[model samples]
Target: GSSGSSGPEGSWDCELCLVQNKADSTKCLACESAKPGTKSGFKGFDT
Candidate 1:
């Protein structure tokens, strides 16, 4: 499938799947969990 909104350049951790997903991704690539606090695709990047 095609990609969605490509946000910041920072990866995010999936709390449900415990897997790291790409920042360009809008949801957890593993468990397909919707990113928390995601309103505009901007995710956490404090790493």
Candidate 2:
């Protein structure tokens, strides 16, 4: 029994640095921000 529907992950644009990272990445390569584009607990690309 399996849902049997999945695809490769995509990229995420850093909210703060606007850097694109793999979906599986834990941090932004540009700013070292956390997952989901959070830098030091602050949402990235807030500006």
Candidate 3:
């Protein structure tokens, strides 16, 4: 199971674009939207 793009494993649903991105990703690759809740200056751990 060593295939596909590199970076963090798994995926998270973007609240803005509803696109699934790697867990380590900080933004949406499809719409280039920043990760939600990042404006609060806090880290989101769970969905």
Candidate 4:
């Protein structure tokens, strides 16, 4: 797939984020968790 846009270094920027992928989609294949691993385990993150 061709790049939707070109950067200063001729690299393509994903429409979803700053990272670049070889596939047509702009986002990576990693799983995005909607919630944290545990509730209130860390600082104020669970709040």
lDDT of 2 by residue, 1-47 (tens): 24544743477778888878887788888899976644467555865
Stretches of candidate 2 exceeding 4 Å from the true structure: 1-9, 37-47
**What is the lDDT for 37 in model 1?**
66
Error of 4 at 42 (Å): 54
Please give the distance, in angstroms, between residue 10's alpha carbon in candidate 2 and its true position after superposition: 1.4
Ranking the candidates on lDDT from highest down gives 1, 3, 2, 4
Model 4 C-alpha lDDT per residue in residues 1-47, reported as the tens digit of each score: 26554634333444434454433343353332122125654565552
What TM-score does prediction 3 earn? 0.49
Per-residue CA lDDT of candidate 3, range 1-47, in tens?
Answer: 58976775577778777888877888899998987644556776878
Report the number of clashing residue pairs per model: 0, 3, 0, 0
lDDT for each of the candidates?
A: 0.79, 0.73, 0.77, 0.40
For each candidate in turn, the TM-score is: 0.56, 0.50, 0.49, 0.20
Q: lDDT of model 4 at residue 25?
A: 47
Using TM-score as the measure, the top candidate is: 1
Ten residues in sequence with the least summed lDDT for candidate 2:
1-10
Cα displacement (angstroms), candidate 4, residue 1, comes to 27
- Highest-scoring model, lDDT: 1
